[PDB]
Write a protein that holds these residues in place. Structure first.
Motif, PDB file in Angstrom:
ATOM      1  N   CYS A  35      -3.786  -9.278   7.592  1.00 51.92           N
ATOM      2  CA  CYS A  35      -3.234  -8.156   6.887  1.00 51.92           C
ATOM      3  C   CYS A  35      -3.883  -6.862   7.362  1.00 51.92           C
ATOM      4  O   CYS A  35      -5.069  -6.808   7.681  1.00 51.92           O
ATOM      5  CB  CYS A  35      -3.360  -8.380   5.373  1.00 51.92           C
ATOM      6  SG  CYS A  35      -2.913  -7.000   4.266  1.00 51.92           S
ATOM      7  N   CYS A  38      -6.067  -5.592   4.300  1.00 54.17           N
ATOM      8  CA  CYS A  38      -7.204  -6.409   4.034  1.00 54.17           C
ATOM      9  C   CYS A  38      -7.288  -7.391   5.179  1.00 54.17           C
ATOM     10  O   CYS A  38      -6.265  -7.924   5.553  1.00 54.17           O
ATOM     11  CB  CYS A  38      -7.026  -7.127   2.690  1.00 54.17           C
ATOM     12  SG  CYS A  38      -5.777  -8.448   2.602  1.00 54.17           S
ATOM     13  N   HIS A  59      -0.188  -7.338  -0.790  1.00 59.46           N
ATOM     14  CA  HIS A  59      -0.233  -5.942  -0.330  1.00 59.46           C
ATOM     15  C   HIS A  59       1.123  -5.439   0.108  1.00 59.46           C
ATOM     16  O   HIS A  59       1.453  -4.284  -0.110  1.00 59.46           O
ATOM     17  CB  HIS A  59      -1.286  -5.695   0.774  1.00 59.46           C
ATOM     18  CG  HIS A  59      -2.694  -5.579   0.275  1.00 59.46           C
ATOM     19  ND1 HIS A  59      -3.782  -5.913   1.058  1.00 59.46           N
ATOM     20  CD2 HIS A  59      -3.124  -5.120  -0.913  1.00 59.46           C
ATOM     21  CE1 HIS A  59      -4.847  -5.651   0.311  1.00 59.46           C
ATOM     22  NE2 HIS A  59      -4.491  -5.166  -0.892  1.00 59.46           N
TER      23      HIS A  59
HETATM   24 ZN    ZN Z   1      -3.712  -7.556   2.185  1.00 61.39          ZN
END
Ligand code: ZN
Ligand code: ZN
Length: 72
Positions: A35, A38, A59
């Protein structure tokens, strides 16, 4: 020339044959696509990908409001 030298879109490194996977027509290391918000290694199994950025489903929902789907 790109034949047995694939270059990765998730980490822009040249992918070697065993690691050369193709997710969403993008050629990359099975191990690298995490990601973009993150560094969650969401690679192959459960991921959410967008043009440009690989995002985790949580997200992706919050930030991009596109797909996600985590019992949502
Ligand atoms: Zn994420
Ligand atoms: Zn990579």
């Amino acid at each position: 020339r790109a034949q047995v030298k694939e270059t990765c879109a998730a980490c822009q490194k040249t992918v070697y044959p065993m690691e050369r996977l193709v997710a969403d027509k993008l050629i990359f290391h099975n191990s690298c696509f995490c990601c973009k918000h993150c560094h969650t290694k969401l690679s192959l199994g459960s991921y959410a990908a967008l043009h440009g950025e690989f995002y985790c489903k949580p997200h992706f929902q919050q930030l991009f409001k596109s797909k996600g789907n985590y019992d949502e």
